[PDB]
Amino acid sequence: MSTTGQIIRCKAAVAWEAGKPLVIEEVEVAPPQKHEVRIKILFTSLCHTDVYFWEAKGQTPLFPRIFGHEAGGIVESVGEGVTDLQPGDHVLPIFTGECGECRHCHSEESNMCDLLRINTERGGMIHDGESRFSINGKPIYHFLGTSTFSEYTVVHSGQVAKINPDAPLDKVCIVSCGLSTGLGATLNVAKPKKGQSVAIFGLGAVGLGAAEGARIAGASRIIGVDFNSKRFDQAKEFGVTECVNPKDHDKPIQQVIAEMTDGGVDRSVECTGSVQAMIQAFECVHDGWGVAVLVGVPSKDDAFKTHPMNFLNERTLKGTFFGNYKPKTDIPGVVEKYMNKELELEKFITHTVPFSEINKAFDYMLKGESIRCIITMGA
Amino acid sequence: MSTTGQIIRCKAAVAWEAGKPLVIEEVEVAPPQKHEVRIKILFTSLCHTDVYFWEAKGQTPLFPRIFGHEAGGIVESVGEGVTDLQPGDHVLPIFTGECGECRHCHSEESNMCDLLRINTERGGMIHDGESRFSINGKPIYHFLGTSTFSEYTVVHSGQVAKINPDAPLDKVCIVSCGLSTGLGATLNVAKPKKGQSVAIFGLGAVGLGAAEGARIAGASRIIGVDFNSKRFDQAKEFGVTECVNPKDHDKPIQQVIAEMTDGGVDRSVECTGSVQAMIQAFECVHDGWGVAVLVGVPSKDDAFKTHPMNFLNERTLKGTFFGNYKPKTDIPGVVEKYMNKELELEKFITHTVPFSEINKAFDYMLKGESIRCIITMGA
Numbered sequence: 063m064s065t066t067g068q069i070i071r072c073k074a075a076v077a078w079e080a081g082k083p084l085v086i087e088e089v090e091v092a093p094p095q096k097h098e099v100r101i102k103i104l105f106t107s108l109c110h111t112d113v114y115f116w117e118a119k120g121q122t123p124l125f126p127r128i129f130g131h132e133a134g135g136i137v138e139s140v141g142e143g144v145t146d147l148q149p150g151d152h153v154l155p156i157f158t159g160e161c162g163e164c165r166h167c168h169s170e171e172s173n174m175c176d177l178l179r180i181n182t183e184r185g186g187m188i189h190d191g192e193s194r195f196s197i198n199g200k201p202i203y204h205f206l207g208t209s210t211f212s213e214y215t216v217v218h219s220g221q222v223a224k225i226n227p228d229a230p231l232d233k234v235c236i237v238s239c240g241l242s243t244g245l246g247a248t249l250n251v252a253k254p255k256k257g258q259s260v261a262i263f264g265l266g267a268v269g270l271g272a273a274e275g276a277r278i279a280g281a282s283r284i285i286g287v288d289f290n291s292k293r294f295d296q297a298k299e300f301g302v303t304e305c306v307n308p309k310d311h312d313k314p315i316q317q318v319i320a321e322m323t324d325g326g327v328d329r330s331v332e333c334t335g336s337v338q339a340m341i342q343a344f345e346c347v348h349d350g351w352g353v354a355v356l357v358g359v360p361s362k363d364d365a366f367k368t369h370p371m372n373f374l375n376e377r378t379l380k381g382t383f384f385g386n387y388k389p390k391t392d393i394p395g396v397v398e399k400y401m402n403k404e405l406e407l408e409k410f411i412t413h414t415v416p417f418s419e420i421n422k423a424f425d426y427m428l429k430g431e432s433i434r435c436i437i438t439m440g441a
Numbered sequence: 442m443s444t445t446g447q448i449i450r451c452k453a454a455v456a457w458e459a460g461k462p463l464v465i466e467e468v469e470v471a472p473p474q475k476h477e478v479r480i481k482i483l484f485t486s487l488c489h490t491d492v493y494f495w496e497a498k499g500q501t502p503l504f505p506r507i508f509g510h511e512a513g514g515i516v517e518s519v520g521e522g523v524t525d526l527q528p529g530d531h532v533l534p535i536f537t538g539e540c541g542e543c544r545h546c547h548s549e550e551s552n553m554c555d556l557l558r559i560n561t562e563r564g565g566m567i568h569d570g571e572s573r574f575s576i577n578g579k580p581i582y583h584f585l586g587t588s589t590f591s592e593y594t595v596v597h598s599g600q601v602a603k604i605n606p607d608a609p610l611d612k613v614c615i616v617s618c619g620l621s622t623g624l625g626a627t628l629n630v631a632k633p634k635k636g637q638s639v640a641i642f643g644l645g646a647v648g649l650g651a652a653e654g655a656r657i658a659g660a661s662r663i664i665g666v667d668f669n670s671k672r673f674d675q676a677k678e679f680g681v682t683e684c685v686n687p688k689d690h691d692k693p694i695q696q697v698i699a700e701m702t703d704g705g706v707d708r709s710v711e712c713t714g715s716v717q718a719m720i721q722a723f724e725c726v727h728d729g730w731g732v733a734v735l736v737g738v739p740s741k742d743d744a745f746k747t748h749p750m751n752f753l754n755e756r757t758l759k760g761t762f763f764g765n766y767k768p769k770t771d772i773p774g775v776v777e778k779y780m781n782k783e784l785e786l787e788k789f790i791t792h793t794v795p796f797s798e799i800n801k802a803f804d805y806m807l808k809g810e811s812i813r814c815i816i817t818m819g820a
């Protein structure tokens with residue numbers, strides 16, 4: 063309130079160099095411009111997407127930078143022409159937006175907003191190409207339009223979802239990424255029917271969300287596939303009924319799955335980012351009616367490759383961005399499902415650290431087995 | 442009737458050598474065994490599938506052989522345990538079957554019958570591995586279980602569709618292949634909505650069937666693509682609204698289409714058999730909601746290849762066998778649509794010759810621009 067229209071002085075975790083530990087710095091946060099809001103961050107988290115651009119290996123090295131794109135916060139002030147958000151609103155900043163004006167935003171199927179779709183190299187604000195962060199007079203790059211590793215951040219209002227103000231902001235700060243992506247990959251894109259079989263490649267947060275969606279859809283068999291056998295017991299909490307490590311088999315995994323299911327699974331969801339797993343996820347679905355959904359992001363420019371007859375045998379291949387959920391229209395409904403005990407969120411939380419110890423979240427992530435770490439603001 | 446249970450002596454067009462002209466021979470046709478029927482052929486036609494296996498380039502050279510898989514005929518007699526067909530029934534023998542007992546035959550989506558799905562190398566009958574054709578005591582290979590280039594042929598009853606006995610058998614003899622495949626590729630698999638745009642790659646019989654389906658679906662723009670500009674005027678009779686030759690453009694055809702439609706077509710149907718056209722058909726559909734359907738059969742084992750991000754941008758890739766139509770359950774309904782003036786068939790007929798001049802049908806086919814040639818039995 064007293065900060066409305068004013069520059070805020072607060073702390074942010076700044077990445078000065080690729081792959082080096084973040085530094086808690088005193089920064090200045092400009093007030094929000096047209097169509098922007100300024101958000102007090104209460105909880106944030108870390109995922110491989112932040113780590114990938116912080117490591118900047120084979121990536122355009124934008125530094126200094128404030129990473130972070132999964133957070134729960136409260137609106138502090140709104141910029142010109144913002145009417146759907148007001149101070150005090152509980153919100154999730156999300157790495158992609160919904161302008162409400164383009165053909166995608168008017169569609170049933172697509173969340174590929176022409177204005178506000180994710181952009182990993184945009185270092186400033188959409189309104190004016192400027193940064194809202196400075197340190198000692200010098201600007202700092204934004205990340206995904208969210209930059210949630212700060213006590214306050216400025217975000218285009220199209221990337222800010224208003225949610226149930228009774229929702230606990232530490233549990234929902236992780237609906238902005240992997241959970242909703244896998245949940246919607248199964249429910250919106252794969253669309254299994256009751257009793258069907260589903261194979262999930264990758265049992266990180268995305269695959270676990272896909273498993274929850276497959277249980278909500280009523281799948282009778284949910285086969286979780288992962289090179290990492292440590293992730294199996296964890297996965298069974300999220301709906302996975304059988305676990306398969308490819309390392310334990312001489313046969314290719316798509317043959318292993320087809321043999322388990324008499325021709326292949328009804329649905330598959332690829333949640334690894336490995337192009338080889340995308341091929342395998344496609345080839346492991348049944349002929350005639352099988353549907354595979356690609357979710358993982360490939361690191362290189364290897365191409366998906368398969369014999370065309372695999373399609374002529376009546377397989378279908380789909381792909382998803384953020385579970386095909388619209389961030390402003392649909393994500394609040396995801397939170398509502400959590401509030402109505404229809405969706406599991408607490409079991410994603412494997413770690414927690416205060417903001418001053420944010421670098422430990424990188425350690426837990428890079429060591430493996432960390433699903434999400436709740437980074438608590440204030441100390 | 443008088444021929445029931447007897448060997449029939451009749452004429453067939455026999456291929457003795459790869460790529461050499463057929464010879465009209467006096468053959469013997471055995472009576473039908475269990476689950477088989479013997480059919481008097483009144484009209485048959487020729488398509489590239491017959492030519493491909495008659496040329497036998499890179500193909501297993503089964504000779505001598507009776508080709509032919511598009512025909513209209515009348516049941517002469519039925520074998521043991523046949524109850525859905527009786528003598529006098531008007532029928533279409535079809536290159537693939539419907540046993541009615543497997544999971545595909547109980548499905549909504551799939552026509553991939555486990556027992557009777559198409560098999561290009563099967564030279565004998567399913568019942569006993571034997572040929573029902575002999576010439577001077579020596580057997581002749583069957584083709585696709587149909588072998589319609591004979592005055593009489595024996596076919597598994599699962600591959601024989603009973604149709605409206607008032608349907609003209611010369612017009613419907615071409616519903617057994619390209620027409621129904623493209624029609625169902627659009628209506629059953631691509632599923633455009635009213636007002637949407639559809640790009641069709643290849644304007645042979647398959648692409649023309651896809652165009653008819655796109656008009657029935659109410660597509661506002663139907664863009665026909667083909668290297669052969671002679672096929673354009675023809676295509677407009679079948680629903681194509683715009684024609685594009687790739688040769689006339691420096692830009693890749695998928696870019697040409699995207700530029701015509703502001704991001705890409707809503708639906709595409711690939712009806713060429715060229716793997717490069719399958720890639721192009723996929724990449725030319727709009728992001729967010731585009732759906733491409735593969736129909737053409739590739740000659741080699743080149744693989745379909747695309748950047749995985751094309752799917753993550755929410756494109757869908759499907760494939761079809763015979764338009765996903767079940768041959769015994771659905772094909773009679775296709776004929777009914779012709780009988781109710783809802784489907785154009787006469788305009789597929791570009792040529793006609795008597796059976797003794799069947800080799801001319803090969804000439805008209807190999808020269809190009811022939812859609813279908815009605816081969817009339819009896820002289």
Ligand SMILES: NC(=O)C1=CN([C@@H]2O[C@H](COP(=O)(O)OP(=O)(O)OC[C@H]3O[C@@H](n4cnc5c(N)ncnc54)[C@H](O)[C@@H]3O)[C@@H](O)[C@H]2O)C=CC1
Pocket residue numbers: 109110111239240243263264265266267268269287288289290293308333334335336338339357358359360382383384385753
């Ligand atoms: N499509 C979208 O909109 C989104 C895509 N993603 C992508 O989804 C993927 C999954 O993300 P997270 O779950 O956070 O990642 P993660 O790294 O936590 O989980 C990946 C899991 O897959 C396993 N794995 C890797 N290669 C494998 C292979 N060849 N076969 C079997 N298992 C394999 C790993 O052991 C690990 O358990 C990533 O590529 C991420 O970039 C993430 C969020 C949004």
Ligand SMILES: NC(=O)C1=CN([C@@H]2O[C@H](COP(=O)(O)OP(=O)(O)OC[C@H]3O[C@@H](n4cnc5c(N)ncnc54)[C@H](O)[C@@H]3O)[C@@H](O)[C@H]2O)C=CC1
Pocket residue numbers: 374488489490618619622642643644645646647648666667668669672687712713714715717718736737738739761762763764
């Ligand atoms: N999926 C299925 O169940 C079925 C598949 N097919 C396949 O469908 C395809 C089409 O069959 P028809 O219409 O009878 O063949 P067709 O040879 O009469 O027509 C193909 C057309 O595509 C054109 N074309 C070829 N390469 C092209 C390219 N790269 N770009 C643009 N145009 C190109 C040709 O000029 C020709 O007009 C064939 O591959 C056939 O084997 C046929 C029937 C059943």
Ligand SMILES: [Zn+2]
Pocket residue numbers: 160161162163164165166167174175176177178
């Ligand atoms: Zn938009």
Ligand SMILES: [Zn+2]
Pocket residue numbers: 108109110111112131132238239240
């Ligand atoms: Zn994330």
Ligand SMILES: [Zn+2]
Pocket residue numbers: 539540541542543544545546553554555556557
């Ligand atoms: Zn069957």
Ligand SMILES: [Zn+2]
Pocket residue numbers: 487488489490491510511617618619
């Ligand atoms: Zn044919």
